[PDB]
């Protein structure tokens, strides 16, 4: 509820407007304030993005993973919040 | 080139035909025979599935992550090969 209010956002790779990037960081911050487990954090972010920015989003949250994904233009972000990586993108 | 020929496949969650599940395991096995890094393993699997089973697939490979994703019916698998988890699904 406040333990994330000091975490550092580092954008690693984005194809996304600055405003939507900010919203992704804000959403992930909110998720991590509420939830401890990666799957629940990912669920919160995905559902919020489906509401704010239309379906269909997909979210991966974790400390060790690689990915290869396809996304709609201007709808991709990969970033860290503290030591946790978040992949968030729209496809479908 | 042979160091994966003794690894155990454990299906955790699937919405997929038995034959396609077998192909996913086989594909991941081939990928891991060739590539050491999770991102390259994921890329190999995604590209093969796009070819064999049509676009658009997405693949996550790693030891620590959670996810929340949406997929087309009958086109989802989440499994381990040895100690590495593989998420593979079709959306778009």
């Amino acid at each position: 509820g406040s333990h994330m209010s000091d975490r550092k956002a580092v954008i690693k790779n984005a194809d996304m407007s600055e405003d939507m990037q900010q919203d992704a960081v804000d959403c992930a911050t909110q998720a991590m304030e509420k939830y401890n487990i990666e799957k629940d954090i990912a669920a919160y972010i995905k559902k919020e993005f489906d509401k704010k920015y239309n379906p269909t989003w997909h979210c991966i949250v974790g400390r060790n993973f690689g990915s290869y994904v396809t996304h709609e233009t201007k709808h991709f972000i990969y970033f860290y919040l503290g030591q946790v990586a978040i992949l968030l993108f729209k496809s479908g | 080139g042979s160091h994966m020929s003794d690894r155990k496949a454990v299906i955790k969650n699937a919405d997929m035909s038995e034959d396609m599940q077998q192909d996913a395991v086989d594909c991941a096995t081939q990928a891991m025979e060739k590539y050491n890094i999770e991102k390259d393993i994921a890329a190999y699997i995604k590209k093969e599935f796009d070819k064999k089973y049509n676009p658009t697939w997405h693949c996550i490979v790693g030891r620590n992550f959670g996810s929340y994703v949406t997929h087309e019916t009958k086109h989802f698998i989440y499994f381990y090969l040895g100690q590495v988890a593989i998420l593979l699904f079709k959306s778009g």
Partner: peptide
């Protein structure tokens, strides 16, 4: 690599 594909890897 296609423009709308992406490949990610976590740091060590």
């Amino acid at each position: 690599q296609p423009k709308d594909d992406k490949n990610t890897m976590t740091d060590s």
